Design a protein around this ligand. Structure first.
Ligand SMILES: C[C@H]1C[C@@H](C(=O)O)N1C(=O)c1cc(O)nc2ccc(F)cc12
Length: 167
């Protein structure tokens, strides 16, 4: 038993809700919140900008130190950093950005990072400003993640489309 509420169950291990991941994180304090990161951990907009804003820019300060030490992430890769006031940990995961021409097949590699964590609150990778089809992203999530994932979908119209079209 865990503290996530109001989720619709899609499969044995994947759950989905219409929610703001920031507010969802603020209430649940999950062990892991997933950020929709880029390779530079520049959290300017989308999910990353909202998560970072909710940390009063502490996420960005920590991220800049990480990059100065380690260099950029790989597309499809991830790193674990602090969850600040939102979660114990933040798993920064880089899905391919279609608006940068990155290969969509890397989306499966991106979701594989979730399997290193027993339970996660997450957005749909490569959705939103990353330009992928959220329905495809949901399919890859279901077919790749084996750990327990709670997906927060900000837009109510998209949420309804994702549920109604789910196979
Ligand atoms: C994860 C992808 C799918 C879509 C969604 O969750 O609905 N995403 C967003 O990043 C997003 C979109 C949108 O229209 N408003 C948003 C408002 C706040 C926020 F933090 C994210 C969004």
């Amino acid at each position: 038993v865990n503290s996530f509420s109001g989720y619709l169950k899609l499969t044995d291990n994947v759950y989905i809700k219409n929610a703001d991941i920031v507010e969802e994180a603020k209430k649940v304090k999950p062990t892991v919140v997933v950020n929709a990161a880029n390779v530079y951990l520049k959290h300017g907009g989308g999910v990353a900008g909202a998560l970072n804003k909710a940390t009063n820019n502490a996420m960005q300060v920590e991220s800049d130190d990480y990059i100065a030490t380690n260099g950029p992430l790989k597309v499809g890769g991830s790193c674990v950093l602090s969850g600040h006031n939102l979660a114990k940990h933040c798993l920064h995961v880089v899905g391919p950005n279609v608006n940068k021409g990155e290969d969509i097949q890397l989306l499966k590699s991106a979701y594989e990072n979730f399997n290193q964590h027993e339970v996660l609150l997450a957005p749909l990778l490569s959705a939103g400003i990353f330009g992928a089809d959220p329905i495809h992203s949901l399919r890859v999530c279901v077919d790749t993640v084996r750990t327990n994932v709670y997906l927060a979908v900000f837009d109510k119209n998209l949420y309804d489309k994702l549920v109604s079209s789910f196979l």
